[PDB]
Amino acid sequence: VNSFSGYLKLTDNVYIKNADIVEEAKKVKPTVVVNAANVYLKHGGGVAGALNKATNNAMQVESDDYIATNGPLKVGGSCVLSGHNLAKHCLHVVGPNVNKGEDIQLLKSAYENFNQHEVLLAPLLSAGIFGADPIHSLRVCVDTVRTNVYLAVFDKNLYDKLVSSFL
Ligand SMILES: O=C(O)CNC(=O)c1cccc(O)c1
């Protein structure tokens, strides 16, 4: 038994809710929140900007030190950093950005990072401003992630379509 409430069960291990992931992280304070990162950890908008804003920019300060030491992530890659006031840890995962020409086949590699963590609060990777079809992203999630994932979908209209079209 964990602290997540009001999620619709899709599979053995995948759960979904219409929720602001920032508000969800503040309420639950999960072990791991997933950020929809880019390779530079420049948290300007969507999930990364909202979580970064909720940390009062401490996520961006930490991220800049990480990049100055280690260089950019890979598309499909991740790093673990502090969760600040939102979570124990933030798993920054880079899904492919369709609006930048990145290989959508990298979405499965991106989701494989979640398997290193027993439980996560996460967005649908490569959805929103990353330009992928959220229906596709949910299918890859269900077919790739084996650990327990709690998906927060910001848009109520998209949430209802994700549930009602789920195979
Ligand atoms: O849910 C998604 O797939 C995309 N969500 C966002 O971009 C987002 C989530 C929470 C706050 C916010 O300003 C944007």
PDB file of all heavy atoms in Angstrom, residues 8 10 16 135 138 156-167, unseen atoms left out:
ATOM      1  N   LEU A   8      -6.912   5.547 -11.753  1.00  0.00           N
ATOM      2  CA  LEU A   8      -7.596   4.466 -12.487  1.00  0.00           C
ATOM      3  C   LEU A   8      -6.534   3.421 -12.850  1.00  0.00           C
ATOM      4  O   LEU A   8      -5.472   3.769 -13.382  1.00  0.00           O
ATOM      5  CB  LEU A   8      -8.290   5.009 -13.735  1.00  0.00           C
ATOM      6  CG  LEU A   8      -8.906   3.898 -14.608  1.00  0.00           C
ATOM      7  CD1 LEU A   8     -10.322   3.605 -14.169  1.00  0.00           C
ATOM      8  CD2 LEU A   8      -8.846   4.179 -16.097  1.00  0.00           C
ATOM      9  N   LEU A  10      -4.860   0.728 -15.058  1.00  0.00           N
ATOM     10  CA  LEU A  10      -4.864   0.306 -16.466  1.00  0.00           C
ATOM     11  C   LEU A  10      -4.357  -1.122 -16.619  1.00  0.00           C
ATOM     12  O   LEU A  10      -4.893  -1.870 -17.436  1.00  0.00           O
ATOM     13  CB  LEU A  10      -4.008   1.244 -17.322  1.00  0.00           C
ATOM     14  CG  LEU A  10      -4.547   2.660 -17.463  1.00  0.00           C
ATOM     15  CD1 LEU A  10      -3.589   3.504 -18.295  1.00  0.00           C
ATOM     16  CD2 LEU A  10      -5.919   2.655 -18.131  1.00  0.00           C
ATOM     17  N   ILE A  16      -3.380   5.707 -13.770  1.00  0.00           N
ATOM     18  CA  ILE A  16      -3.512   7.019 -14.474  1.00  0.00           C
ATOM     19  C   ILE A  16      -4.520   7.922 -13.789  1.00  0.00           C
ATOM     20  O   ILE A  16      -5.551   7.444 -13.246  1.00  0.00           O
ATOM     21  CB  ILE A  16      -3.791   6.772 -15.947  1.00  0.00           C
ATOM     22  CG1 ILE A  16      -3.559   8.019 -16.807  1.00  0.00           C
ATOM     23  CG2 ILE A  16      -5.183   6.193 -16.168  1.00  0.00           C
ATOM     24  CD1 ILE A  16      -3.467   7.746 -18.256  1.00  0.00           C
ATOM     25  N   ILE A 135      -1.455   8.879 -26.958  1.00  0.00           N
ATOM     26  CA  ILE A 135      -2.007   7.501 -27.007  1.00  0.00           C
ATOM     27  C   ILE A 135      -0.840   6.546 -27.233  1.00  0.00           C
ATOM     28  O   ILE A 135      -0.806   5.478 -26.619  1.00  0.00           O
ATOM     29  CB  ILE A 135      -3.138   7.390 -28.048  1.00  0.00           C
ATOM     30  CG1 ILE A 135      -4.331   8.259 -27.639  1.00  0.00           C
ATOM     31  CG2 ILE A 135      -3.527   5.941 -28.271  1.00  0.00           C
ATOM     32  CD1 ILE A 135      -5.467   8.300 -28.628  1.00  0.00           C
ATOM     33  N   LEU A 138       1.372   6.255 -24.077  1.00  0.00           N
ATOM     34  CA  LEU A 138       0.795   5.371 -23.047  1.00  0.00           C
ATOM     35  C   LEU A 138       0.994   3.910 -23.448  1.00  0.00           C
ATOM     36  O   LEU A 138       1.297   3.088 -22.580  1.00  0.00           O
ATOM     37  CB  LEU A 138      -0.697   5.673 -22.932  1.00  0.00           C
ATOM     38  CG  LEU A 138      -1.423   4.830 -21.887  1.00  0.00           C
ATOM     39  CD1 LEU A 138      -0.814   4.853 -20.495  1.00  0.00           C
ATOM     40  CD2 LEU A 138      -2.897   5.275 -21.846  1.00  0.00           C
ATOM     41  N   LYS A 156      -7.678  17.372 -19.069  1.00  0.00           N
ATOM     42  CA  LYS A 156      -8.845  16.520 -18.715  1.00  0.00           C
ATOM     43  C   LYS A 156      -9.350  15.876 -19.989  1.00  0.00           C
ATOM     44  O   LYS A 156      -9.663  14.657 -20.014  1.00  0.00           O
ATOM     45  CB  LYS A 156      -9.944  17.326 -18.019  1.00  0.00           C
ATOM     46  CG  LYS A 156     -11.253  16.569 -17.818  1.00  0.00           C
ATOM     47  CD  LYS A 156     -11.135  15.279 -17.007  1.00  0.00           C
ATOM     48  CE  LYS A 156     -12.493  14.825 -16.494  1.00  0.00           C
ATOM     49  NZ  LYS A 156     -12.585  13.357 -16.303  1.00  0.00           N
ATOM     50  N   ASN A 157      -9.433  16.633 -21.067  1.00  0.00           N
ATOM     51  CA  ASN A 157      -9.962  16.070 -22.321  1.00  0.00           C
ATOM     52  C   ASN A 157      -9.070  14.930 -22.826  1.00  0.00           C
ATOM     53  O   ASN A 157      -9.551  13.892 -23.303  1.00  0.00           O
ATOM     54  CB  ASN A 157     -10.127  17.195 -23.345  1.00  0.00           C
ATOM     55  CG  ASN A 157     -10.848  16.748 -24.592  1.00  0.00           C
ATOM     56  OD1 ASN A 157     -10.281  16.042 -25.429  1.00  0.00           O
ATOM     57  ND2 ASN A 157     -12.087  17.202 -24.738  1.00  0.00           N
ATOM     58  N   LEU A 158      -7.754  15.106 -22.747  1.00  0.00           N
ATOM     59  CA  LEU A 158      -6.841  14.042 -23.222  1.00  0.00           C
ATOM     60  C   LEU A 158      -6.905  12.810 -22.295  1.00  0.00           C
ATOM     61  O   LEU A 158      -6.894  11.694 -22.809  1.00  0.00           O
ATOM     62  CB  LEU A 158      -5.424  14.604 -23.227  1.00  0.00           C
ATOM     63  CG  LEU A 158      -4.375  13.569 -23.551  1.00  0.00           C
ATOM     64  CD1 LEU A 158      -4.610  12.907 -24.878  1.00  0.00           C
ATOM     65  CD2 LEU A 158      -3.030  14.229 -23.537  1.00  0.00           C
ATOM     66  N   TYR A 159      -6.984  13.057 -21.007  1.00  0.00           N
ATOM     67  CA  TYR A 159      -7.144  11.993 -19.980  1.00  0.00           C
ATOM     68  C   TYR A 159      -8.317  11.091 -20.349  1.00  0.00           C
ATOM     69  O   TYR A 159      -8.217   9.873 -20.468  1.00  0.00           O
ATOM     70  CB  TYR A 159      -7.310  12.573 -18.583  1.00  0.00           C
ATOM     71  CG  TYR A 159      -7.684  11.529 -17.566  1.00  0.00           C
ATOM     72  CD1 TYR A 159      -6.740  10.678 -16.998  1.00  0.00           C
ATOM     73  CD2 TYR A 159      -9.009  11.343 -17.210  1.00  0.00           C
ATOM     74  CE1 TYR A 159      -7.095   9.672 -16.132  1.00  0.00           C
ATOM     75  CE2 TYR A 159      -9.384  10.348 -16.321  1.00  0.00           C
ATOM     76  CZ  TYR A 159      -8.422   9.528 -15.767  1.00  0.00           C
ATOM     77  OH  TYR A 159      -8.785   8.516 -14.900  1.00  0.00           O
ATOM     78  N   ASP A 160      -9.474  11.713 -20.571  1.00  0.00           N
ATOM     79  CA  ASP A 160     -10.696  10.923 -20.897  1.00  0.00           C
ATOM     80  C   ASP A 160     -10.479  10.141 -22.182  1.00  0.00           C
ATOM     81  O   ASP A 160     -10.897   8.974 -22.284  1.00  0.00           O
ATOM     82  CB  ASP A 160     -11.897  11.845 -21.089  1.00  0.00           C
ATOM     83  CG  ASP A 160     -12.436  12.412 -19.799  1.00  0.00           C
ATOM     84  OD1 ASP A 160     -12.030  11.975 -18.699  1.00  0.00           O
ATOM     85  OD2 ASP A 160     -13.278  13.325 -19.905  1.00  0.00           O
ATOM     86  N   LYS A 161      -9.834  10.725 -23.190  1.00  0.00           N
ATOM     87  CA  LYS A 161      -9.550   9.990 -24.420  1.00  0.00           C
ATOM     88  C   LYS A 161      -8.536   8.858 -24.181  1.00  0.00           C
ATOM     89  O   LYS A 161      -8.657   7.816 -24.805  1.00  0.00           O
ATOM     90  CB  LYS A 161      -9.020  10.946 -25.477  1.00  0.00           C
ATOM     91  CG  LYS A 161      -8.627  10.347 -26.807  1.00  0.00           C
ATOM     92  CD  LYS A 161      -8.428  11.414 -27.871  1.00  0.00           C
ATOM     93  CE  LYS A 161      -7.200  11.217 -28.741  1.00  0.00           C
ATOM     94  NZ  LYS A 161      -7.540  11.187 -30.186  1.00  0.00           N
ATOM     95  N   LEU A 162      -7.527   9.087 -23.345  1.00  0.00           N
ATOM     96  CA  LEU A 162      -6.519   8.019 -23.059  1.00  0.00           C
ATOM     97  C   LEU A 162      -7.201   6.802 -22.410  1.00  0.00           C
ATOM     98  O   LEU A 162      -6.888   5.688 -22.796  1.00  0.00           O
ATOM     99  CB  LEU A 162      -5.447   8.597 -22.146  1.00  0.00           C
ATOM    100  CG  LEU A 162      -4.435   9.517 -22.832  1.00  0.00           C
ATOM    101  CD1 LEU A 162      -3.696  10.316 -21.801  1.00  0.00           C
ATOM    102  CD2 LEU A 162      -3.486   8.704 -23.701  1.00  0.00           C
ATOM    103  N   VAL A 163      -8.086   7.065 -21.449  1.00  0.00           N
ATOM    104  CA  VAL A 163      -8.801   5.959 -20.746  1.00  0.00           C
ATOM    105  C   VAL A 163      -9.734   5.246 -21.718  1.00  0.00           C
ATOM    106  O   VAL A 163      -9.711   4.021 -21.842  1.00  0.00           O
ATOM    107  CB  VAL A 163      -9.547   6.495 -19.524  1.00  0.00           C
ATOM    108  CG1 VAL A 163     -10.499   5.448 -18.956  1.00  0.00           C
ATOM    109  CG2 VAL A 163      -8.566   7.029 -18.485  1.00  0.00           C
ATOM    110  N   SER A 164     -10.542   6.021 -22.426  1.00  0.00           N
ATOM    111  CA  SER A 164     -11.641   5.447 -23.232  1.00  0.00           C
ATOM    112  C   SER A 164     -11.095   4.723 -24.473  1.00  0.00           C
ATOM    113  O   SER A 164     -11.807   3.865 -25.011  1.00  0.00           O
ATOM    114  CB  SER A 164     -12.636   6.530 -23.563  1.00  0.00           C
ATOM    115  OG  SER A 164     -12.072   7.455 -24.477  1.00  0.00           O
ATOM    116  N   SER A 165      -9.853   5.006 -24.920  1.00  0.00           N
ATOM    117  CA  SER A 165      -9.260   4.336 -26.098  1.00  0.00           C
ATOM    118  C   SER A 165      -8.241   3.266 -25.698  1.00  0.00           C
ATOM    119  O   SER A 165      -7.678   2.667 -26.609  1.00  0.00           O
ATOM    120  CB  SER A 165      -8.632   5.325 -27.067  1.00  0.00           C
ATOM    121  OG  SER A 165      -7.523   5.960 -26.478  1.00  0.00           O
ATOM    122  N   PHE A 166      -8.054   3.017 -24.409  1.00  0.00           N
ATOM    123  CA  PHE A 166      -6.957   2.134 -23.939  1.00  0.00           C
ATOM    124  C   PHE A 166      -7.293   0.692 -24.246  1.00  0.00           C
ATOM    125  O   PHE A 166      -8.406   0.208 -23.919  1.00  0.00           O
ATOM    126  CB  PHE A 166      -6.761   2.250 -22.433  1.00  0.00           C
ATOM    127  CG  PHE A 166      -5.624   1.383 -21.970  1.00  0.00           C
ATOM    128  CD1 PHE A 166      -4.319   1.752 -22.264  1.00  0.00           C
ATOM    129  CD2 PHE A 166      -5.837   0.211 -21.258  1.00  0.00           C
ATOM    130  CE1 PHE A 166      -3.265   0.949 -21.853  1.00  0.00           C
ATOM    131  CE2 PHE A 166      -4.780  -0.568 -20.819  1.00  0.00           C
ATOM    132  CZ  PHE A 166      -3.499  -0.204 -21.137  1.00  0.00           C
ATOM    133  N   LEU A 167      -6.356  -0.033 -24.835  1.00  0.00           N
ATOM    134  CA  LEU A 167      -6.553  -1.447 -25.186  1.00  0.00           C
ATOM    135  C   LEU A 167      -6.011  -2.296 -24.037  1.00  0.00           C
ATOM    136  O   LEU A 167      -4.792  -2.405 -23.879  1.00  0.00           O
ATOM    137  CB  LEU A 167      -5.893  -1.743 -26.515  1.00  0.00           C
TER     138      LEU A 167
END
